[PDB]
Amino acid sequence: KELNDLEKKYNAHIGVYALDTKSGKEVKFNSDKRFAYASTSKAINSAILLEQVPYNKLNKKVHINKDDIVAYSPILEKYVGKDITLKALIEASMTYSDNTANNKIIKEIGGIKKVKQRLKELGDKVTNPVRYEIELNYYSPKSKKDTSTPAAFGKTLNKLIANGKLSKENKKFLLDLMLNNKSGDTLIKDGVPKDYKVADKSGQAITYASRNDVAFVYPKGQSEPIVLVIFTNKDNKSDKPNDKLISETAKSVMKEF
Template sequence: MVLSPTRRTGLAALAAFVLVPVTACGPSGSGTAPEAEASAASHATEASAGLAREFERLEKEFDARLGVYAVDTGTEEEVVHRPDERFAYCSTHKAFSAGAVLQRNTPEEMEEVITYTEDDLLDYAPITEQHVDTGMTLMELTDAAVRYSDNTAANLLFEELDGPDGFEEAMEAVGDDVIEADRVEPGLNEAVPGDIRDTSTPRAMAESLRKFTLGDALPEDRRDVLTDMLVNNMTGDELIRAGVPEGWEVGDKTGSGGYGTRNDIAVLWPPEGEPIVLAVMSSRDEEDAEYDNALIAEAAEVVVEALA
C-alpha cells in the first residue's frame, strides 16, 4: 500500500566539480576581496583533492570502479567522482519507468488492471507471482517495480511505455539525452564493460531523479506518489541508507547486475536544509564478480560528510 505522501520541493541547475561551493555576486563595489577569493579557491581545491583520495581509496579497497554524483539542492554544491562515465543502470531504471508511467496516465488509468500469464513471470517476481490469476493495477505494478524491484512488473511497465525505445523517449522528454535504453529485464543487467546498451552516468541519473522527485517532470500528486514509493523501498537498507546519519529520510532505488555492478540512486532529506540528490554506481572487471553493498554505503558516507 502506498502511504500518504511527504511533499518535497526544489529544482535547480547543476555544475561540474568534485566539491564546488556556489557563491553569489554582490552589487558593484561589494564583491569578494581577491584575498578571500583566493582563500576560497584554495579551500575548494583542497576539499576536492581530499574527496578524490577518499573515493580512490574506496576503489582500491573494494577493487571496483566507482561513480558518484551528488548535489545539495539548497546550495548547489556538488560531490563527484567519475560522474560522466557510463555504468549499466540495472534496476535503478525502475524509478524512471514508474515515473514515466505515472506521467502518461491519469489517476483513473493507473487503476486499470493489467493481466499477464505464468509465461510472463521472470525469476525474480516476488509480487507479480502472487497475482497471476487476478492481474494487477498499473499503480500496483509501479509499486512492485519500485519498492520490491519485481522484474516482471518492470517489463509490464516497459510494455506500457512501448518498450525500451518508448522509455528512452520518455527520458528524453524530461531532458535526459544520456541514457541508452535497449533491452528489458533481465537482459539489461548483463553490464558487459564497454557495452553502452542500457547504461547511463551518475550525473544523468541524479539529474533525472531530481526532475521526477523534486522538479516538474510530474504533477505534484503523482510526484508525491513516486517519492513515497522510493521512501518506502524495501531493497536499500544496506546501501545509501546505511551511509547516512540517523534522523535523515532516504528515498532510493537500487540495482545490480553482472560484473559486480551495484547501484543506488536516492534523494536524502536531512533534518535541516534542502534535499541532497545522490547517485552511486559501481562495477568490477570480472563477469562473475560479486558486489559489496558496503562500497555504496561508504561512498554515501563520504558524500554526506562533505555536504552536511
C-alpha cells in the same frame, strides 16, 4: 574519506553524482563513466508512467498473461491470467523489484522506444535503455547497452521527480515507496547520518559486481532533497560486490553538504 581511497580499499570502481537541489551544489567522481544501472531504472520507468496517469486513475487494470512473466517476479507470478491495477504494478516494481512489473510498466508507457524518446526530451542523451528485464542485467564493459553515467542518471532523476511534472500525490506515492523499501538498508541508508531521510531504489547487474543505489536524501531541516547516484563495479565478471562500499561512499559524500 577520499573516494580514491575507497576505490583502493574495496578494489572497486566508483561513480558518484550528487546534487543539492536547494543550492545547486554538485559532488562528482567519475561522473561521466558508463555503468550498468540495473534495477535503479525501475525508478525512472515508474516516474515516466506517473507523468501520464493521474493518481486517481491508478486503479486502471491491465491483464497479465503467461507470456508476460520473466524471472524474479515475486508478486506478478501470482497474477497469471489475472488483472492488476497500475498502482499495484508500481508497488511491486518499487518495493519488491518485480521484473514483470517493470516490463509491463514499460509496455504501458509504450515500449523502450518511448522510454528513450522521453529521456531525449529531458535532455538525457546518455542513458541507453536497450533490453527488457532480465537481459538488461547482462552487462559487458565493452557494450553501452543499458548503461548510463552517474551525471546523466542523476540529472534525469532531478528533472523527473525533484523538479518535474508529477502531481503532488503521484510524487508522494513514488517517494513513499522509496522511503519504505527495505532492500536498500545496507546501502546509502546505511551510510548517512540518522537524521537524514533516505528514499532509494537499489540495483545489481548479473556481471562485474555491478552494485548501485540512487536516492533522494533529505537532511534534517531541509525539505529539498539531495539527489545521490552511486554506481560501482569491479574488474572481473564473477566478482561479488560489498554493500559497504556504497554505505562508505554515501558517508563521505554527505560530508560535503
